[PDB]
């Protein structure tokens, strides 16, 4: 269906340490494909996914080019966000970058995005409509009428709606063996007594991609979304997900619920029961 | 791939 | 590396003046600058054009034949002037060295006439 | 405001003596440079500065020094003038590495004589 390729980046001041450190990842849906450290033994912008491996040696030596361009410009932008905060040269301090294009079915623009934070709040955004900023507080505002000066948002729509939308379209391709292959979770009920009057029934859901899925438990039938514990969806570490989902039931009432799965890798919804 | 211009200073 | 192929160029005043510049660069991203030196030996910055940039950069009389596929950032200087006469210097910076150093042309003496 | 505010305008030296080049911005400008402009060299980058406590060499830095103890200070420093230092020296400014406000001081004329 829809696919999003993004681009995160992450720059930490260290006061009497050195200078900041800069991390970037990008990604095409929940796959990793390429990263940066400013911390590595030579700092290059490296592959990360097999489908991004046969890209030449121009697009290696440029995107290394950009990744160094954008922690420089974080280090000059950690100082001043110094000045318009009125904060001390001493303090640790975080930029934050995200940005990206989602694509339909067909490979059209759905949904472009460009925003950055400071010390883990928004600072700055692109507005949905690519065309128009939303500044979080007076600092922001500062940059807002620095980037209305330099018409930075026509240049970064031209970005989101031609090479993000194309290139993400060429990784698709280049990659459908597994970023167009939905992996189904492997599904299981485990149940753990508490007491002689109830019991937890914990719905496992193993080894899926992409990270999206419905894990829902069900009484006679009925949802039981409220009294349902879900766990954050975490990374097995070789690209798929783990997710489960937890009710807390009567003992000798377990026959009375259901657990269903919905996933892309699967033909058809699950529908499970706690073995018997 | 990246996007880049000049002058994104905040 | 730029070439500005002229090192003189007259106008009539009130006339208009284009200031050829021609640049070689391997890079995507890159930056076009136009800098006035008059005789007193000042560099003025006048106009810049950046390589994603859509539209030709205007600065009052300034503006940038921005070719981009003829690798071409020739500038226009409307109703010339007395005062315009002077060094004009072409410049870029690229991503090669992260827009580094700036790479100046030799310069066009522009002479306008009366 | 003001920008750049380079001094002196001119400087004649004897060959041996020492001069501080100094430079001042008053825009909050990150990066910091000092150039050289010769006959047939074009304009050639001494030394440079990304921010405060930082610098780095050009092109030419051999027989010049700096030092960047605040954001609105680029002193260069010639600790032995030769003649082959008469120059016009460029303290350029900008807001930083890719910075595209690319402001140049007034000049300094630089005659070395024995």
């Known amino acids: 269906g829809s696919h999003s390729m993004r681009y995160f980046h992450t720059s930490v001041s260290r006061p009497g340490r050195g200078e900041p450190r800069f991390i970037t990842v990008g990604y095409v849906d929940d796959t990793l494909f390429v990263r940066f450290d400013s911390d590595a033994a030579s700092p290059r912008e490296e592959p990360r996914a097999p489908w991004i491996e046969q890209e030449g040696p121009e697009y290696w030596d440029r995107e290394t080019q950009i990744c160094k361009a954008k922690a420089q410009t974080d280090r000059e932008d950690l100082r001043t966000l110094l000045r318009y905060y009125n904060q001390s040269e001493a303090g640790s301090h975080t930029l934050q970058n995200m940005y990206g294009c989602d694509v339909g079915p067909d490979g059209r623009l759905l949904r472009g995005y460009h925003q950055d934070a400071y010390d883990g709040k928004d600072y700055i955004a692109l507005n949905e409509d690519l065309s128009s900023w939303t500044a979080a507080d007076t600092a922001a505002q500062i940059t807002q009428r620095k980037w209305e000066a330099a018409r930075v948002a026509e240049q970064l729509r031209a970005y989101l709606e031609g090479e993000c939308v194309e290139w993400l379209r060429r990784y698709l391709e280049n990659g459908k063996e597994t970023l167009q292959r939905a992996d189904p979770p492997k599904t299981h009920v485990t149940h753990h007594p508490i007491s002689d009057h109830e019991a937890t029934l914990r719905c496992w859901a193993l080894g899926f991609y992409p990270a999206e899925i419905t894990l829902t438990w069900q009484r006679d039938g009925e949802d039981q979304t409220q009294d349902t514990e879900l766990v954050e969806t975490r990374p097995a570490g070789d690209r798929t997900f783990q997710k489960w989902a937890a009710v807390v039931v009567p003992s000798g009432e377990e026959q009375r619920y259901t657990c269903h799965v919905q996933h892309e890798g699967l033909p058809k919804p699950l529908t499970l029961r706690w073995e018997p | 791939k990246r996007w880049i211009i000049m002058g994104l200073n905040k | 590396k730029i070439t500005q192929t002229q090192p003189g160029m007259f106008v009539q005043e009130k006339e208009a003046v284009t200031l050829d510049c021609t640049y070689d660069?391997?890079?995507?991203?890159?930056?076009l600058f136009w800098y006035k030196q008059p005789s007193s030996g000042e560099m003025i910055f006048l106009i810049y054009?950046?390589?994603?940039?859509?539209q030709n950069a205007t600065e009052g009389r300034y503006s940038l034949n921005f070719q981009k596929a003829r690798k071409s950032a020739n500038l226009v200087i409307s109703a010339s002037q007395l005062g315009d006469s002077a060094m004009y210097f072409c410049?870029?910076?690229?991503?090669?060295?992260?827009?580094?150093?700036?790479?100046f042309g030799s310069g066009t003496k522009l002479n306008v006439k009366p | 405001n003001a920008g750049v505010t380079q001094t002196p305008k001119f400087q004649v030296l004897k060959t041996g003596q020492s001069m501080t080049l100094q430079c001042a911005q008053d825009?909050?400008?990150?990066?910091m440079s000092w150039y050289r402009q010769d006959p047939g060299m074009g304009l050639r980058l001494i030394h440079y500065?990304?921010?405060?406590?930082?610098?780095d060499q050009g092109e030419v830095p051999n027989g010049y020094n700096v030092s960047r103890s605040t954001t609105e200070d680029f002193p260069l420093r010639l600790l032995s003038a030769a003649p082959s230092q008469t120059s016009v020296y460029f303290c350029?400014?900008?807001?930083?590495?890719?910075?595209?406000?690319?402001?140049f001081g007034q000049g300094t004329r630089l005659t070395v004589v024995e």
């Open positions: 350029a400014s900008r807001e930083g590495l890719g910075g595209t406000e690319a402001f």
């Open positions: 660069t391997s890079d995507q991203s890159y930056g």
């Open positions: 054009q950046g390589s994603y940039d859509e």
């Open positions: 410049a870029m910076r690229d991503l090669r060295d992260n827009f580094n150093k700036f790479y």
């Open positions: 825009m909050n400008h990150e990066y």
């Open positions: 500065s990304v921010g405060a406590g930082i610098t």
